Design a protein around this ligand. Structure first.
Ligand SMILES: CC(C)(C#Cc1ccc(-c2ccc(Cl)c3c(NS(C)(=O)=O)nn(CC(F)(F)F)c23)c([C@H](Cc2ccccc2)NC(=O)Cn2nc(C(F)(F)F)c3c2C(F)(F)[C@@H]2C[C@H]32)n1)S(C)(=O)=O
Ligand SMILES: CC(C)(C#Cc1ccc(-c2ccc(Cl)c3c(NS(C)(=O)=O)nn(CC(F)(F)F)c23)c([C@H](Cc2ccccc2)NC(=O)Cn2nc(C(F)(F)F)c3c2C(F)(F)[C@@H]2C[C@H]32)n1)S(C)(=O)=O
Ligand SMILES: CC(C)(C#Cc1ccc(-c2ccc(Cl)c3c(NS(C)(=O)=O)nn(CC(F)(F)F)c23)c([C@H](Cc2ccccc2)NC(=O)Cn2nc(C(F)(F)F)c3c2C(F)(F)[C@@H]2C[C@H]32)n1)S(C)(=O)=O
Ligand SMILES: CC(C)(C#Cc1ccc(-c2ccc(Cl)c3c(NS(C)(=O)=O)nn(CC(F)(F)F)c23)c([C@H](Cc2ccccc2)NC(=O)Cn2nc(C(F)(F)F)c3c2C(F)(F)[C@@H]2C[C@H]32)n1)S(C)(=O)=O
Ligand SMILES: CC(C)(C#Cc1ccc(-c2ccc(Cl)c3c(NS(C)(=O)=O)nn(CC(F)(F)F)c23)c([C@H](Cc2ccccc2)NC(=O)Cn2nc(C(F)(F)F)c3c2C(F)(F)[C@@H]2C[C@H]32)n1)S(C)(=O)=O
Ligand SMILES: CC(C)(C#Cc1ccc(-c2ccc(Cl)c3c(NS(C)(=O)=O)nn(CC(F)(F)F)c23)c([C@H](Cc2ccccc2)NC(=O)Cn2nc(C(F)(F)F)c3c2C(F)(F)[C@@H]2C[C@H]32)n1)S(C)(=O)=O
Lengths: 220, 220, 220, 220, 220, 220
């Protein structure tokens, strides 16, 4: 990764074993649950495209998910070349050449070239760009590997309200969509799909009632 | 997080993997017990709004509580905006515009802005403001998810006074309350809820006795 | 905590997760045995009053012990104000204001104010003062939570001497008293409460006999 | 390893114990699965030939594979020697003689030579050259020790398409192949090996479909 | 501990949590086996008397041994005082008064005094002197708590010579002895205590044979 | 150990607890298998003779092996004195006195004297010399504690070839000898001691066939 030495110059450090293991275990333990996106984003903090590939390649199993990931990377990398045409001149001693979509993915870029792009007077972040594509690809995985649909989430007759909401938003979260789509679902289904006993209590508070006001009401 | 390098200048570092694991395991292991708020406040020492969202996003499950936490944060951001006006003047010298309540949340704010706000020569603590909002929501969650009521706590004749006293003060910690209220419950309820054999000993000690004195007297 | 950077200026660092976890586990694993006082004193090395509160607040359970702790802190904090009257003047650019008992406990002091008191040309240690009170409060807990009394410790007929002494001093240690009280007990009870077989052997060595001389004699 | 101190000069450090344990446990736990090559490449970041031999020697068992790894390394060293001639000229100024293929292996090379080669102002990467040779042998070992054949992989009617797709791409990863070959197998074999009910859905999607599209369509 | 910062000046640091856990677990796991003395000597590297007392106080249980350790330390302190006279002269310039035996123990000495003694331009090693006293007591404890006697160790005909040889040398390590005494026991007892079938082989090898030679000869 | 501070001066650091524990566990877990030599060499990286003794003394059990080790050290230390006669003059302010065999073993050398020899303008490495003897002594242990002889290694009738080779070289490795002795064994016994079915296949490839070519042929 590109960390900052005490000299204020962003230097390339080796990806710590602690970081690798943590990434391998979250994938083995938590699989592709929503909390795998934050862990990756945090464990990839300041990573070079090669550091990212390293992490992804350490993922044992889920090779299907990994292929979709490569497909999404290929997709987004094609959006980088269709929006950033290659800019061919000579080579200067001030500036780096124009990065390409494949260069960002680390396929056609070396570590030095990657490192330089991130450590540049006008910095072009190939790491954060690459990481941006990956997290999008993992959102398609979490969406896919989510068996539930928010519509299929209904409160059971003997189910505590806190549990139904935990399930409502667990499904809502995995089903990645606009915050507007996810906000409309709550105001539509959270009370509509509640069991009749608590549902009349919820209707008995008014739509402008917080989730806290809903959940404290249907306690027992 | 915004840590202080040996140069005395507050520099930004990556959230350590250890810190992530600690925050995740204290939520998995302890759930929303009162001792998770201190753990959060400690594990988020000098964290940026992006670091705080990272920790909150790593919390697998409890999505009901997490949405409640978001609602508390939204309320606090609205209050911040009403407390702090938007400013008309255009782009001033070595200065940071005032963060909006959403900027403190990091929903509308870049990490560089966050780092700049925290590292500004007259610092503005966008991360700590957000952390206060988060902690308020955590306190709401703990109180909601605490079944015990201080009035409900009572000492069985078979039960030790010290075991009952643990539960009584655990219930008082679990249920957010003003320190005076907690003292008032401690003054009146603890003896009255205690079993009569222990209670008569407590009455023998009189009002001016340490909890140690009360405990040693009922111990036998 | 207030650690020393390589610049020789005592700087405030964040309490490491390793330190927190270690404190949580010793309390969960070892509870309030005597070895919890050293672990706290060591894990609190260089801690600010807020760092201490953090640790104490992370303690899950034993809330009874925690209330006695607050009581003892309240007691000692009252001894700080009865011996250090508040000293009100203007504010200078050399020196810090006079600390108060509540300020030491972190109740009525911010981290900056705490930090400054510890990092002062004439240093006033609010951390080591606060820690001094806490360890005293934990000595009352270990004393209380010790079910045994040194008088109730007697060597069994089929009990090896090394085991009886381990129990004699295990109880002796938890029963915090003057080293003079604890020295008198040994010279009184260690041999008096030994079983008759070994007891005559001990009497057969003379009072000026080391514990080693006692324990090697009653081997088998 | 050759790490970069805060002086900007690449200095030599000892291979951390954590790094050793990680490399040993990933071989004990994962054996020679494809995910051990990335783990090796990462755990050997900036390693000297002596550090690489250290890791390889710590591998308990798999001695057949290890001897195969040695043979691959020997071949690469012979190829290096034929690529790079031995040089007649005697002992030049601030310069490093060309390493022989055995010197890159570290069999005939001192650690000081290795450190000097890597730290030379025009660096020669003796450790990275050796690491490439090692990784080639590791790839040979993984392919040999992978029982699965991409043609052998087939979807049972009972088996989920996504589970079969995992196996198919795991087998393609386990068996070293050119990326075009792997794409060719993916294009033709994946649908044909899939079970007919899923296969007819895949045929309905047509050639231009994401693996996600294929998977969601056969999912049900 | 007194560690050396990058400024070449020995600075004081806090005893790391890892170091504490290691010292506690090696006592819990290994108790007072001979291998705990090296572990202590290593875990107390460059420790102050306060750090040494911290480690000793963290030892849960074994209070008989701990009191024995205190007695050994008291004896050594008395011997130090008789070796080193108290000095009449009043308060000299950049100099440290001579520590009393109790000061080395840290019973009568402040940590600042300890740090000053160790960091004095002509250093006085109050911590290392105390550590020697502690280690002497530890050796007394190990020898007392070792049941085995080198004369008692003997090889069963069923028992392997190498297993017996392990026990023989373990017993010699467990029982503190002069190196010449241990050599004398090794020279005479090891063959004589060995079983006759192995013993006649040992006699065939003759006096001038390595323990390896003896072992390989009795091995079969 | 003697590590390099950022000032470029090799300074003596304390042996980390992580290093100790790692050495204790590899001996307890892996005993004297061949992979214990690399772990020691790596865990001893940059160690002083006292640091080495510390590690060896932490080894719980295998005291027989430990005595042979002392014997081998005594042997090699005698080769240091028979090749390096003591060189007695005065004491200078440039240079260190001539080291002795016992000084290298740490028996008759202090840490300062050891440290100085390693941190000398003309460096004389007492640590790497001592470590060189130890690893030789452990090669005699691994040889001894290896019950198998390469001659007694034969492929079973229902044994996969990969397993027989793993055993052939596992034994070959533990049986430390010249690489020439170990190379001759392979070309002699690896195919000679194969079961008849695979053996004719191996003979059917020619002696100039790699181990890979052998092992891919006898797959099934
Ligand atoms: C750092 C990177 C590491 C990141 C991130 C990042 C950036 C900004 C924010 C954010 C903060 C504060 C507010 Cl007030 C809002 C807000 N207000 S609101 C009510 O929509 O109107 N929205 N957002 C989101 C956005 F900023 F994008 F608009 C908000 C956030 C927070 C993180 C957070 C987690 C737990 C508890 C509080 C907050 N929220 C989300 O992540 C989106 N989310 N969605 C859903 C659902 F249930 F609907 F599916 C859920 C969340 C969820 F909050 F996590 C929580 C369990 C429910 N994280 S990473 C890979 O970890 O993400
Ligand atoms: C660091 C930041 C991380 C913080 C903090 C922070 C700041 C100040 C204090 C504090 C210290 C000393 C005293 Cl004497 C009082 C005192 N005396 S008083 C006015 O008469 O009641 N009050 N306070 C609290 C207040 F600051 F408000 F004054 C005191 C504290 C204390 C520290 C402390 C923990 C455990 C044992 C002793 C002390 N922790 C709490 O008190 C929390 N607690 N709550 C309850 C309730 F009531 F629920 F049962 C109980 C506790 C409890 F102590 F564990 C005990 C079993 C009862 N922590 S953070 C986000 O983690 O908070
Ligand atoms: C650092 C802070 C972290 C501390 C501390 C600190 C400061 C000084 C001393 C100390 C050292 C050497 C001597 Cl010779 C004496 C001595 N000589 S004597 C025989 O009384 O005349 N007394 N002391 C104590 C004092 F200095 F206070 F006077 C001595 C000590 C030592 C620590 C030590 C532990 C184990 C083995 C040897 C020593 N001893 C105590 O802690 C008090 N103790 N009591 C009792 C009992 F059995 F009686 F209950 C026991 C101890 C005990 F030694 F632990 C041991 C199991 C028995 N620790 S902390 C929170 O960890 O404490
Ligand atoms: C760091 C060093 C440590 C390295 C490396 C390194 C360099 C570049 C890339 C890479 C990135 C993005 C794209 Cl879009 C492609 C792409 N697209 S393409 C041309 O159409 O196929 N190819 N490559 C690979 C190549 F560089 F060759 F172009 C791509 C990579 C990728 C990173 C990556 C891992 C997982 C998920 C997404 C991405 N890892 C692999 O691909 C390995 N892999 N293999 C196979 C096969 F085929 F066996 F099934 C499969 C994978 C797999 F991705 F896991 C997935 C389930 C299929 N790693 S190291 C020694 O560890 O390697
Ligand atoms: C670092 C400080 C931390 C230290 C130390 C320190 C200093 C020097 C030495 C040492 C080195 C080499 C040789 Cl050749 C001899 C040698 N040869 S001799 C004169 O003929 O006997 N003697 N010594 C010891 C002495 F220094 F006294 F000379 C030798 C040592 C050695 C190092 C060592 C450990 C294991 C295997 C080889 C070597 N450790 C011990 O010897 C302890 N030991 N004891 C016994 C007894 F007898 F009980 F069975 C046994 C051992 C044993 F080696 F494990 C072996 C199974 C027998 N450690 S510390 C507080 O941990 O000590
Ligand atoms: C650092 C210190 C820490 C060290 C070391 C060190 C120094 C140099 C070398 C080395 C490297 C490359 C080549 Cl091509 C050859 C080569 N070519 S060859 C085919 O003989 O002609 N020989 N050597 C060895 C030597 F340089 F000494 F000549 C080679 C090595 C490598 C390490 C290595 C381990 C695993 C896989 C590849 C390599 N090999 C050995 O260690 C000796 N070995 N022996 C045997 C057997 F099976 F025969 F018993 C085996 C090995 C073994 F390779 F480990 C492997 C399981 C078989 N390690 S340490 C205490 O860890 O050792």
């Amino acid at each position: 990764p590109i960390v900052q030495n005490l000299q204020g110059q962003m230097v390339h450090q080796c990806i710590s074993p602690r970081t690798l293991n943590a990434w391998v275990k979250v994938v083995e333990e938590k699989a592709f649950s929503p909390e795998v996106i934050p862990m990756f984003s945090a464990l990839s903090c300041g990573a070079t495209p090669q550091d990212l590939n390293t992490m992804l390649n350490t993922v044992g199993g889920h090779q299907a998910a990994m292929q979709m990931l490569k497909e999404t990377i290929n997709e987004e990398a094609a959006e980088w070349d269709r929006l950033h045409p290659v800019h061919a001149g000579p080579i200067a001693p001030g500036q780096m050449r124009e990065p390409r979509g494949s260069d960002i993915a680390g396929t056609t870029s070396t570590l030095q070239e990657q490192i330089g792009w991130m450590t540049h007077n006008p910095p072009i972040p190939v790491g954060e760009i690459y990481k941006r594509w990956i997290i999008l690809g993992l959102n398609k995985i979490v969406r896919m590997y989510s068996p539930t649909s928010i519509l299929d989430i209904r409160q059971g007759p003997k189910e505590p309200f806190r549990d139904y909401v935990d399930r409502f938003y667990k499904t809502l979260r995995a089903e990645q969509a606009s915050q507007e789509v996810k906000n409309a679902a709550t105001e539509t289904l959270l009370v509509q799909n509640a069991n009749p006993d608590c549902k009349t209590i919820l209707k008995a508070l008014g739509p402008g009632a917080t989730l806290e006001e809903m959940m404290t009401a249907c306690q027992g």
